[PDB]
Structures are given as C-alpha cells and as structure tokens.
Structure 1
Amino acid sequence: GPLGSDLKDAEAVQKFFLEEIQLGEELLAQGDYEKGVDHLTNAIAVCGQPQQLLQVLQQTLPPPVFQMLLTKL
C-alpha cells in the first residue's frame, strides 16, 4: 500500500534520518559544506516536528552555512 501503511516504513525513515545526519556531519567535518547541507536538509525533510533540530543546527553551523541550509530547506 501507500508509504506509511506498513510497519517497516517507520523503521526505514528512522534509519534514513540517522544516516543523513551521520553523512551530513561527516561531510561537514571533512569540509564539504555543500554536500553536508544536502544531507542535513534531507534529514530535516522527513522529520515531523523539526523545531529543536533546526535550532541546534543554527547553533552549531557557521552562519553562512546555516544560510545555505535555509536555501535548501
């Protein structure tokens, strides 16, 4: 059936969110801000209530990189 109707859908999105945050932060740690933010915004995009995540991101990202995140939000 449609996405969300299978118990396995919840497990796949939880894994995806964690993967994207892990990949994003590795990329940012290597200096690839561009690709890092792509993955960070994928993570935010599947998060049902991303208030605290966004707030922590803006506290941990260089302001110019946070502005780029906003363009890809």
Structure 2
Amino acid sequence: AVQKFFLEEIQLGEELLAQGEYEKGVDHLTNAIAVCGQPQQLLQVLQQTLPPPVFQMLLTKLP
C-alpha cells in the first residue's frame, strides 16, 4: 500500500480531477499523501498539479 495501493489513490483523485468533483479528488489525494512513504518531497510536486482553487482543499486536509 506504500507504493502499490498508493498509485491508484492518485488515479482515483486524477479521474476526479478530470471529473470536476475536486473535493472527492482531494480526498483520494489526501489519503495518498497520508500513506506516501516520502510525502514531504511531494510538496513541490503537488503545489502545481492542481488548479489554484483546489490548492486550498488539499492543504487543509493533509493535517
């Protein structure tokens, strides 16, 4: 689940990112970051993968 189930958690978020329900995409993304082995390195990665409205939902759900 560190890398195997972790990949689909973004893929659930990525499809919901392409869907339009970004709040559900953040939920699958914030679970991936919670289970990621090194999610602190993804701070620069995840700060530009989303539209600017979606940044607020992601940052408020990580802690």
TM over 0.5: yes
Greater length-normalized contact order (CA 8 Å, ≥ 6 residues apart) = 2
Class of the TM-score when normalised by the shorter of the 2 chains: 0.7 to 0.9
Measure, in 2, the Cα distance between the counterparts of 1:52 and 1:61. Answer: 17
5+ residue gaps, structure 1: 1-11
Q: Could you say what the CA RMSD is over the residues aligned between the two structures, in angstroms?
A: 1.3
Give CA-to-partner distance per residue, 1:40-71, whole Å, 9 cap, x none.
01000011211332322211211221111011
5+ residue gaps, structure 2: none
Query: 47, 61, 69: which one pairs with 2:36?
Result: 47
What TM-score, normalized by structure 2, do the two folds share?
A: 0.83
The alignment partner of 1:26 has SS state of helix
Measure, in 2, the Cα distance between the counterparts of 1:38 and 1:15. Answer: 18
The alignment partner of 1:21 has SS state of helix
Measure, in 1, the Cα distance between the counterparts of 2:27 and 2:61. Answer: 7
**How many residues matched?**
62
Q: Percent of aligned pairs with the same residue?
A: 98
Runs (4 or more) in structure 1 with deviation over 6 Å come to: none
Q: Which has the higher helix share?
A: 1
* Range with bigger deviation, 57-66 or 18-27: 57-66
